[PDB]
Amino acid sequence: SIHEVVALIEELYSPHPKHDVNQIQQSLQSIQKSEQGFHLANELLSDDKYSANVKYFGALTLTVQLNTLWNVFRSNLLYLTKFSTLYVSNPNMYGQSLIIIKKLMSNLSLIFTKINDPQNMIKQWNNPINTFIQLMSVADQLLLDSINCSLTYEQLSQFVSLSQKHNELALTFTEVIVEDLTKFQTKRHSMSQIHEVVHEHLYISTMALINLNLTAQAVFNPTVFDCITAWINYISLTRRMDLSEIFQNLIDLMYQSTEGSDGYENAEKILTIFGNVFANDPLLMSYDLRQQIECIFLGNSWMLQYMNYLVTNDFFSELKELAICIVDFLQINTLSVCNKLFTNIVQDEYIQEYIKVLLQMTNFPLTPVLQEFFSVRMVDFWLDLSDAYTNLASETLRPNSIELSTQIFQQLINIYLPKISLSVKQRIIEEEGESTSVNEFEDFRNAVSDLAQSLWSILGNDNLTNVLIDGMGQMPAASDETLIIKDTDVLFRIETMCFVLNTILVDMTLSESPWIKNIVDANKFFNQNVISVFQTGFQTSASTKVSQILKLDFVRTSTTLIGTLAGYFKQEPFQLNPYVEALFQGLHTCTNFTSKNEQEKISNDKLEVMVIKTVSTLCETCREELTPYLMHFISFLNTVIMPDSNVSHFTRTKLVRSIGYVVQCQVSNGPEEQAKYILQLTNLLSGSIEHCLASSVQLQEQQDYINCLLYCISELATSLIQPTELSEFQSFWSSDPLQIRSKIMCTIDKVLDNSIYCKNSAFVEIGCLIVGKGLNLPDGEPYFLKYNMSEVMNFVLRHVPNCELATCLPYFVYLLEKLISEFRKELTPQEFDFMFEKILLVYYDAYIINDPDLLQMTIGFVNNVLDVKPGLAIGSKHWTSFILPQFLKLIPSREKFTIVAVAKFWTKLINNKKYNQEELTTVRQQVSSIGGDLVYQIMYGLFHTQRSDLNSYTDLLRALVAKFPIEAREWLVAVLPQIAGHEKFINKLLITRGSRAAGNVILQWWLDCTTL
Amino acid sequence: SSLCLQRLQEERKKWRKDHPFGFYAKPVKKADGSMDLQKWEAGIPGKEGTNWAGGVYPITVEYPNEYPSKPPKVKFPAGFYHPNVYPSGTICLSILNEDQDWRPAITLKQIVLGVQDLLDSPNPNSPAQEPAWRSFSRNKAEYDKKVLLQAKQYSK
Structure with a gap:
């Protein structure tokens, strides 16, 4: 059957095998481990005529040793036997035979991990490297016993390095053992003492071998680099292991590795090792070696030569790794530089040149993301330096601390401002298109924005904000009318200044500050240049996808800065007029146009959203200043609500919300003048709704149009609520002679009287929201839509029988709970019995008792009555007859919300203090x-x-x-x-x-x- | 405690070094300009190709003194619409519940990706919001329309 085993083993690795690959694989898993699988594996490894894959399967079959104490010894003997066999066949001249070499190494590593765990006998291994060392010297089976646990010195270990493959095999054995000890430690932590064994024997041999590869030129092999990182990783997981001389000699090798000497290969690998140390466990390197790293990176200098070698060859990935390593190295040093700079506790000219070189490196030619990542990683460093300077004690500052800090951070502003210039993103989209580098550029801009937010606590308004304002306010961006900049350089400069100014101004309050009025009045072209950016970007024809995306970016930045300026507009109204006119000119350009080719409309919607968002912020803060523009806007809305428009239902709603924001502050001329606008808007919404329902028999388009107008009514009801920030309005809206509530209630009735709408949950939801808008409002507030008890009651009684009881009842019930909390003083237990009978009890036994949503709905209603006025629920006719027996049977319910509902019911019934x-x-x-x-x-x-x-x-x-x-x-x-x-x-x-x-x-x- | 602040510092370094595109996160500033390490502001971008696309939804993360023994509390703005967001904004997520799948080793990146995944794939076992879950289960068109309008609401 051995011939059958070799047959299906070779069949598994054939290009197009017979029967099945999964079946012959399962049969191969069935031959092992059983009592002949071990002898089969030994015969597969001892036979030289078998293929490399078959011998690998022999070592894999050996790996199944988990199947007690004696078979492990009988296995390990044959493991080390076939080990020494192939490892003697390798060093002379074999080649490509080290695959089974690595697998047998892995098997011995698993043996070393399993035996040294807690659980005639067999002692511990303690040192497999030495055992492998003496195994290359060929009474025969008796040798492995004395060779195993005790072995030679360092001179014979260096003599083993007579060949190169000897050093390669030793580095790989220690590497695999370390990576496996790392994997075993990470899996489960039962080790705790095997690390000590490696520390006492394997650590010494590995340190002596690595240092021998580093110091001696002939013994050096690049594989040791991959082995060093492995050892460092294992050390980073445990804890005293020195590693100081290893780092020292790696620094000496990197400095000796040049373009002519090594081709910067060893320097790259050693830099990858240092980048791993600094990025994971930077404390692993001592202070002296970090000082040498500082003197090598910052200095003609060797570091400048390596950077020029990477730049001239267009190696952006390796330059990225270099930036990551240097930044992770510089981030751990902060308190020493900050102290020798800004605290007083020959060095000054040294640290002034130190900061000067660091700022020159911060600038760093080659545009970002596309080429370099130095500025991207340096942002986090400057954030730590800003927070460190801000966290410094007040009494510890240097005499020249504020001046040197202002100078350094202003040079930072002058360096990073051209870095985040939109010309970089333009070149990124030109060269690389829509790749992930654009996304990394957006993350870079967000990082610099937070950097400026942290830098403002040092520079102040005049050194950071006034620099941008005077930069864009004292010179016109567009001399010709219609505000066309025509110039690309100043356009990129002004888009950068608008973005930074916006992120700085969001953190302010433009109402309490008279400084903003002083700084803007000293700049003639400030508002003109902001509108120049908006109009230039908005009127820009989108030809390619790049010009379309840049158009959207300019509109986003402009609308955001305009949205941030409403407090200043309240402080300076005469500069507000050019903004309103420029905004409505662009707002009409992106409204009345229907040209869609084809995904351009998603950019039209993004522009329309940002515009209406800015309009919502301005109407929210500058309500008083915007009174004269109302009469034009209601007419334009009458033209937008037409069953043919480019607006979204969301933009229609937020537009109605903006007009209502301006109308809310029209309480000056009395309730009559404000009510003229309120009645006009009421008649327009209800007239267009009734026009759509009774003319074009309601389809999906008419349903979306009706839902849009209902949401417009909801936004208008919310917008007319007085912000938390006399009696004539109360008596007017209590009487409402214009019948605002009468028209709104009859309109809601006309919508809910249609069978296509009443059984829809969305229309019932928005209906109960609008009717219950005046409920639970603070008493005394002259709300227009404040409904009494009987109107909302007859409304619910009107539309509850004809609706869908399954999905539409909880909205009417929540409206009744709002009415109960509002009219708690005037409620009567008989009226509560009337509501309980009409709305719930009749529909209970059929639609509620077997429906979990309606069941928890009814329980929550009774809980609301117990929370508001217990006398209504206690004095109920169905209290002892219906509520108690039903809720008693519902205690061991299967629904979580029903269980919590019943538990809260009886808990409130017992712990109620309003009784x-x-x-x-x-x-x-x-x-x-x-x-x-x-x-x-x-x-x-x-x-x-x-x-x-x-x-x-x-x-x-x-x-x-x-x-x-x-x-x-x-x-x-x-x-x-x-x-x-x-x-x-x-x-x-x-x-x-x-x-x-x-x-x-x-x-x-x-x-x-x-x-x- | 003191494990708490050490861990939050490490989290801040780790996030700032590597995180998904379109997210942001930063400690809020205290009155003295120092960072409140136990209260962060973040933004969660909607996944492209979902009704959540185009929004960047802001959240607050409040770390208890016993973090990382106890998970942080993560909240959307009050009134955020989603079946797994309480009225308070509290997100119902297995990894954010100490009684479920929270493990001290869970990082901010994993939390924010969990929230992103939850966005377009609500978990029915945590109905924190009656109207969102109800619309999801009974009027999917309304739910999708609401999600689209909320994406416009929180536009990137």
């Missing part, structure tokens, strides 16, 4: 009657339930025991035995507690009562 003295006596009397069945339902649910619902009737039992401790024992001695004798134990232990630590007694009772 009258008569109501409290009647409640205690009724509870002292049903309490029995209550404990039965509690233990019934607790028995049939499982974890995560145990704490539900715990708070119910906590309230029942605290409120009724005496009857608690009488009800427990009756309910416990039904749901054996050990149950009595909870009685003494629970009532003794009172409350606050039950459950702990309860699960200790459930544990008893479950096994039985």
